[PDB]
């Protein structure tokens, strides 16, 4: 006989192992729900250059349950991965992707020069105000730096979105890195995502 599909495995393969990734200014957000998140496949990985988790322990994820789990993915430069953390500043954190100050979840990154060489990846260089936590600005409106209004890109009128140029001869800091931001939230509510050890815990109705 065949063991039943009482619970399903979370689509971490569709997220981490995706063929293409989003730009930081337009980061892709995927909801994870009604599945068992096996973090052991993420642990058995040598390519992950970053694996930092906040509010929780990276060794206790397979034994925890959460009411709402999100998966955010984008491609950022190597020296900008540090900005994908609570309380950080910079062009990426201020104008592209800002983690909340009281952020519970994990931030995983790995080098992708083998796949994202060349590539169409953009970042926002200018913005009137700093991005609020988990906000997305996909606007293409010119940035008015001076007092003179902007009718076309010119002296004091800059186009907001600027392009990345990824080459193999670049340093590690300027090389492309794929970031996956797992965002966790636990409330006094039924659980939607659980670890393998807590598989029966509230994942069943």
């Amino acid at each position: 006989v065949r063991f039943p599909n009482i619970t399903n495995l979370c689509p971490f393969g569709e997220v981490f192992n995706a063929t293409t990734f989003a730009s930081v200014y337009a980061w892709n957000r995927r909801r994870i729900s009604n599945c068992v998140a096996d973090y052991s496949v993420l642990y058995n990985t040598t390519s992950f250059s970053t694996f930092k988790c906040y509010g929780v322990s990276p060794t206790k994820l397979n034994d925890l349950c959460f009411t709402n789990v999100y998966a955010d993915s984008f491609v950022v430069r190597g020296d900008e991965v540090r900005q994908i953390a609570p309380g950080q500043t910079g062009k990426i954190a201020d104008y592209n992707y800002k983690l909340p100050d009281d952020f519970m979840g994990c931030v995983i990154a790995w080098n992708s020069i083998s796949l994202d060489a060349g590539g169409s990846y953009y970042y926002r260089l200018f913005r009137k105000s700093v991005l609020k936590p988990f906000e997305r600005d996909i606007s293409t409106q010119l940035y008015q730096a001076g007092d003179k209004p902007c009718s076309v890109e010119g002296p004091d009128c800059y186009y907001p979105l600027q392009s990345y140029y990824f080459q193999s001869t670049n340093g590690v800091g300027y090389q492309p890195y794929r970031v996956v931001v797992l965002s966790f939230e636990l409330l006094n509510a039924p659980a939607t995502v659980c670890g393998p050890k807590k598989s029966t815990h509230l994942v069943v109705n």
């Binding site: 260089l125 200018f126 940035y143 730096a145 001076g146 007092d147 002296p155 004091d156 800059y158 600027q162 140029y165 080459q167 001869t169 670049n170 340093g171 590690v172 800091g173 300027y174 090389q175």
Partner: protein
């Protein structure tokens, strides 16, 4: 919207748009400097013109933000360097003519060869051989050939080009509000706007001529000692009262008296301070030369070399399949790309230049986090000194034992301290009068003090007086012996190497005080002190953001270069040379010439 705030957004758009444009220009120049081809001189010029055209638009846009409104010196230093209409001041034809002159000069130097009249295909070029004759040969007439042929075949090609290169570079600097092209070069040491730490362009001329007067006594007693030991090598050739013939020194020009060590070592029976023969016995590959230099920087806590450095650098001579500019250069291509172009040999000199050019890269890697325009050394002397601070500690007998190049049971003696200090003076002291005279000539040529009909007359008049070196063959104004050096043909300042030398002994004092050293300044070492490297790194990471005057005070304690740490480094050799020169004449005569006739009429 303050002018300062909208200028930071302008510099932000510049610092990000310039990263890839400068990178592709460096990717093209690297392929040419390693693969000299006409295909790669078009690709270099096409990428360089893209970068120069980009700089012209940014220079014009930067002029809209007045420097008086910005109160942030980091922004003002950025806007100032971006504003200056470097070559834009020249006409379209004059800018293309100067770039053709600048290119024709660089190629003639790296492609010029002297051919056999008997066999036209028998050619010898400076990097493969003419340099070897001038480094290892002991024949007066063979050395005279490589010396005269390089200046009568390549220098003569450079004479009418240099005359145009002077008037074009002088028209450029004057339209940029400089007195001449020498003043434009001297502006690298300029500091203005920081009270108590400023420095004028004319102060460099004063301080160099004030510090050089205090090196004249030590140079004299070394020049008299070298004259004597050169007479034993070249009998009936050098006068006991005259100047050294130019073709009998260490290299093609006399830049470094390093190669004269075998002819000059005081106690030649002791173990060799020159560890060239040990590197062959203990077979050492180019890789080990740079891997061992990596350990020196790792030891002081400075970073190890990038993976792309080992993958993308050219550390060995490629071969006959392609030509490359074999002069040791360090490349900060941008975007974290750090490379070294060196046609490394197994000599001890290449072992010490590997430290010099890795010190370039370690400096380049440190200020990488700074804005693009501030990604540069505080001055040219600071950049060339960083590698010399390391090679100063890497050439000591104590360090040479730890890498196994010396005997495990090696003993240090008063004798070994002398013959080591002499080899140091052959490279460090022997180069100062050559560097001061070469810059003083160019400075006077750019100023117009030396007329065109007297370029070669004053060049050898000054080399006899300041350097104490006489020409073996009389040279007319059809020659351009200055241009026979890479730096004079490839538009590079030379006063770097004078200030470099004085800085490296100021930095070594402070760096060896951070580390625990209770001994003399020579035989010092900082090869495991993570405290001395941090004191060095805290200036390496600053770049050109803070002035070199203040950057020097925060490390060595002085806001100006001091020659006293140098004179104190050679005090054992100076008092020793004065004893050995009791039987010899200390000084030289500007009238004796090897080509003079010994007869009356």
């Amino acid at each position: 919207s303050t002018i300062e705030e909208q200028a930071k957004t302008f510099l932000d758009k510049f610092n990000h748009e310039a990263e890839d444009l400068f990178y592709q220009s460096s990717l093209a120049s690297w392929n040419y400097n390693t693969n000299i081809t006409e295909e790669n001189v078009q690709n270099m010029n096409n990428a360089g013109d893209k970068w120069s055209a980009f700089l012209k638009e940014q220079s014009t846009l930067a002029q809209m933000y007045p420097l008086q409104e910005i109160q942030n010196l980091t922004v003002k230093l950025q806007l100032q360097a971006l504003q200056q209409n470097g070559s834009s001041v020249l006409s379209e034809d004059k800018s293309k003519r100067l770039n053709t002159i600048l290119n024709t000069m660089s190629t003639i130097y790296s492609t010029g060869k002297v051919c056999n009249p008997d066999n036209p295909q028998e050619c010898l070029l400076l990097e493969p051989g003419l340099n070897e004759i001038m480094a290892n040969s002991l024949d007066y007439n063979e050395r005279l050939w490589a010396w005269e042929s390089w200046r009568s075949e390549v220098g003569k090609q450079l004479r009418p080009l240099y005359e145009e290169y002077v008037v074009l570079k002088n028209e450029m600097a004057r339209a940029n509000h400089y007195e001449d092209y020498g003043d434009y070069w001297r502006g690298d040491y300029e500091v203005n706007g920081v009270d108590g730490y400023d420095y004028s362009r004319g102060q460099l001329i004063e301080d160099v001529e004030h510090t050089f007067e205090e090196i004249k006594p030590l140079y004299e007693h070394l020049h008299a000692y070298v004259r004597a030991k050169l007479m034993n090598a070249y009998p009936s050739y050098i006068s006991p009262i005259g100047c050294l013939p130019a073709h009998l020194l260490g290299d093609m020009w006399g830049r470094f008296w390093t190669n004269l060590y075998s002819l000059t070592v005081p106690f030649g029976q002791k173990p060799n301070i020159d560890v060239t023969d040990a590197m062959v016995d203990q077979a050492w590959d180019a890789q080990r030369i740079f891997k061992e230099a990596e350990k020196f920087f790792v030891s002081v806590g400075l970073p190890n070399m990038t993976q792309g450095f080992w993958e993308n650098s050219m550390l060995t001579d490629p071969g006959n399949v392609q030509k490359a500019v074999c002069h040791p250069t360090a490349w900060d291509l941008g975007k974290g790309d750090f490379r070294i172009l060196m046609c490394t040999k197994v000599t001890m000199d290449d072992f010490l230049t590997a430290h010099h050019e890795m010190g370039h890269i370690q400096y380049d890697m440190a200020y990488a986090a700074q804005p693009f325009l501030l990604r540069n050394g505080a001055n040219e002397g600071f950049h060339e000194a960083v590698g010399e601070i390391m090679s100063l500690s890497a050439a000591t007998p104590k360090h040479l034992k730890s890498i196994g190049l010396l005997s495990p049971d090696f003993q240090e003696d008063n004798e070994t301290e002398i013959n080591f200090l002499l080899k140091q003076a052959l490279t460090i002291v022997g180069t100062l009068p050559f560097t001061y005279m070469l810059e003083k000539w160019r400075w006077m040529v750019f100023k117009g003090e030396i007329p065109k009909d007297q370029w070669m007359k004053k060049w050898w008049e000054m080399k006899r007086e300041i350097v104490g070196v006489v020409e073996p063959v009389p040279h007319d104004e059809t020659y351009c012996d200055p241009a026979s050096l890479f730096h004079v043909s490839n538009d590079y300042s030379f006063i770097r190497y004078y200030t470099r030398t004085l800085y490296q002994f100021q930095f070594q004092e402070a760096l060896c005080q951070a580390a625990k050293h209770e001994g003399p300044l020579h035989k010092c070492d900082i090869s495991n002190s993570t405290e001395a490297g941090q004191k060095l790194f805290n200036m390496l990471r600053l770049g050109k953001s803070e002035p070199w005057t203040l950057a020097l005070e925060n490390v060595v304690g002085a806001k100006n270069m001091n020659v006293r740490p140098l004179l104190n480094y050679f005090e054992p050799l100076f008092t020793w040379l004065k004893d050995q020169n009791k039987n010899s004449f200390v000084g030289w005569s500007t009238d004796w010439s090897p080509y003079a006739d010994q007869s009356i009429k």
